[PDB]
Design a protein around this ligand. Sequence first.
Ligand SMILES: Cc1ccc(NC(=O)c2ccc(CN3CCN(C)CC3)cc2)cc1Nc1nccc(-c2cccnc2)n1
Length: 244
Amino acid sequence: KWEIPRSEITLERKLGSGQFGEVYEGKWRNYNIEVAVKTLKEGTMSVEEFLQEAQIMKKLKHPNLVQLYGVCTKEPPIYIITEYMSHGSLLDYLRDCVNAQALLDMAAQVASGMAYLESQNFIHRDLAARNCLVGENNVVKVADFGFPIKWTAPEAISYNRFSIKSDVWAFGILLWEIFTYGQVPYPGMSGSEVIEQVERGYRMPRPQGCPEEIYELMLQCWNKSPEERPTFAETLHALETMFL
Ligand SMILES: Cc1ccc(NC(=O)c2ccc(CN3CCN(C)CC3)cc2)cc1Nc1nccc(-c2cccnc2)n1
């Protein structure tokens, strides 16, 4: 049902690479549309486990989550195909320097996609600006491509206790990357310093020009106790109800 015949897809550019496979921009000849194409490097893992990513994705449908288009699974190399986002990663897009209202809009869209995931009983586990994509009209979508200490909540580092609340922690960090135009967090600090300082109560200070109301939401995301962090639903309402 999600099988696409392989001849319909034409590869055009290497986007990124790795150890389980690579990703390309391609063209889908039928729809006259650009696609992203993720490939299985044979023998780096099973075909079955590669396609478990596509299985999850068939259950999810939301304007701020990357849409699966289909798979090519009849022979190697196995493909998972999604929409292509014209402006690439949020992080790269922020790094070209917009208004605080537009930065807010982008944050809301991520929260929106996360809220949907939460509602469907999934966790991300790797939320970060590098993992969100930008299209036209400032549309933002959450993706997962795919340490990393600086995005990972304390209980996750210490007890391997990942949860939707550890995701809320990472969204606080992402909020900070957004409102700094994509700076690397905890500037200068190494990982072990970050783990130690954070444990003792350290939080990044408010970025230059960032609204206090926005900064206050980041602090709520970074509560030391996970049960006291806001839900993603709560988080979206908070963002929509900031004005100016
Ligand atoms: C080609 C592909 C294959 C798979 C995916 N997968 C996902 O984006 C994804 C998102 C959410 C989940 C759900 N979630 C994962 C976390 N776990 C714990 C459970 C639930 C799963 C996969 C995206 C894509 N798209 C993709 N991948 C890399 C780069 C790009 C890309 C780059 C530049 C411009 N446009 C697109 N696009």
